[PDB]
A paper describes a structure:
Phage satellite P4 [name], [name], a building block of the viral capsid, inhibits hexameric transcription termination factor, ρ, by presently unknown mechanisms. The ρ hexamer adopts an NTPase-inactive, washer-like, open-ring conformation until NTPs (preferentially ATP) are engaged and RNA is bound at the SBS, leading to ring closure and RNA entrapment inside the ring. Our cryogenic electron microscopy structures of ρ-[name] complexes show that [name] dimers clamp two inactive, open ρ rings and promote their expansion to higher-oligomeric states. ATPase, nucleotide binding and nucleic acid binding studies revealed that [name] hinders ρ ring closure and traps nucleotides in their binding pockets on ρ.
In complex III, two hexameric ρ rings are bridged by six [name] dimers, that connect ρ(A) subunit 6 with ρ(B) subunit 1, ρ(A) subunit 5 with ρ(B) subunit 2, etc. ρ subunits are designated by increasing Arabic numerals from the centers to the peripheries of the complex. The different rotational orientations of the [name]-bridged ρ rings in complexes I, II, and III lead to different spacings between the innermost ρ subunits, which directly interact in complex I but are separated by a gap of ~ 30 Å and ~50 Å in complexes II and III, respectively. We further refined complex II (ATP; global resolution 3.8 Å), complex IIexpanded (ATP; global resolution 3.6 Å), complex III (ATPγS; global resolution 3.65 Å), and complex IIIexpanded (ATPγS; global resolution 4.25 Å). The ρ hexamers in complexes I, II and III exhibit slightly increased inter-subunit and ρ1-ρ6 rise values (8.4–8.8 Å and 42.2–43.9 Å, respectively). [name] interacts predominantly with one ρ CTD via the tip of its long coiled-coil (helices α1 and α2), the N-terminal part of helix α2 and the C-terminal helix α7. [name] helix α7 (residues 170–186) is placed in a cleft between the two neighboring ρ CTDs, covering the corresponding nucleotide-binding pocket. [name] R43 at the tip of the coiled-coil engages in cation-π interactions with Y197 of the main interacting ρ subunit. Finally, [name] P171, A172 and M175 (helix α7) engage in contacts with the T154-loop of the neighboring ρ subunit and cover the Watson-Crick side of the ATPγS base bound at that subunit, stabilizing it between ρ M186 and F355.
Residue numbers in the entry:
A (entry chain f), B (entry chain e): 4 to 190
The structure:
């Protein structure tokens, strides 16, 4: 039943990412409003710059978390859907692959790897031709609702906001700065 | 009828390789019979050694051709069986794998490559799990007799006699010698 946990984790990550996004947006609109004012407020200006940077880093982290959770839930859906499909048609699929993987357990590790490699690239051209027919298909009936709610692909905002990457030293220093800012805003 | 052509071509190659080994074996039998004799026959000994080596090369070539035909017939049988089976079950197969194959043609080349790679390792894990369950695999009912005639693996003779490889220079040298020997023997 881990699919439900993955789905709710993905939903929570998406909600947190959206909260980071709109909080950051409010932050930069307030920063623009303050800089447009006559008052110099240099301390206010550079503390708002620091806030902008740290909130943008938090948005990047939340987007990365959401992408990873979406990939994890998609992987869980793929694995259990393939599990039930394999339970349903394993004997027939093996009979299709009988010239290749017959006596699989009675073989060494490297021979097993080579045999399954032949099986799977044969499956490669099989699926290539099947899709090259040109038909259109929908989601699996059992878990259609979850996969439709999470979507085929994540949001473009989640991918273009997370395209930038930080070195581990930057990650550590921004984590420290975010903790300091959280402590400051808590009090 | 392509499978029938592969089958009888493999049978012809197997018969030719059997004839090659029979001729070679008679060759060293006669060579050792002459060597055991007290007659000098030095030129006869040298030409019989040439006979032995050219027959060994011919046996190697015949075994290699037979192995190649075996691989070809196994590959075509796998292709046909896979085509039939997953043509039958492709609706559920692609429903299980939908979250990554939506809009495959509309997607770009790198997206296509990523999607097919994800499909591949999903099938990897599914088939290795099924094989880890350990139930026996049987040949397809439609082509059981043919696959039993060819068999899962060629004879051990074909694989140990062809272990050694020949450089191209030796290849056409031996081909020329074999042609000359066939020409003289036909007379």
């Amino acid at each position: 039943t881990a699919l439900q946990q993955a789905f709710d984790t993905c939903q929570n990550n998406k909600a947190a990412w959206l909260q980071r996004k709109n909080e950051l947006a409010a932050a930069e609109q307030e920063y623009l409003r303050l800089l447009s004012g006559e008052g110099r407020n240099v301390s206010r200006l550079d503390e708002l710059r620091n806030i902008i940077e740290v909130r943008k880093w938090q948005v990047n982290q939340a987007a990365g978390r959401y992408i990873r959770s979406h990939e994890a839930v998609q992987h869980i859906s793929i694995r259990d859907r393939l599990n039930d499909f394999m339970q349903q048609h394993g004997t027939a699929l093996a009979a299709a692959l009988a010239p290749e993987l017959m006596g699989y357990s009675e073989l060494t590790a490297i021979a097993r790897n080579c045999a399954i490699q032949r099986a799977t690239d044969a499956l490669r051209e099989a699926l290539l031709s099947w899709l090259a027919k040109g038909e259109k298909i929908n989601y699996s009936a059992q878990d259609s609702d979850i996969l439709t709610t999470i979507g085929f692909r994540p949001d473009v905002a989640s991918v273009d906001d997370s395209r930038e990457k930080f070195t581990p030293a930057q990650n550590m220093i921004f984590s420290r700065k975010s903790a300091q800012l959280a402590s400051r805003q808590s009090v």
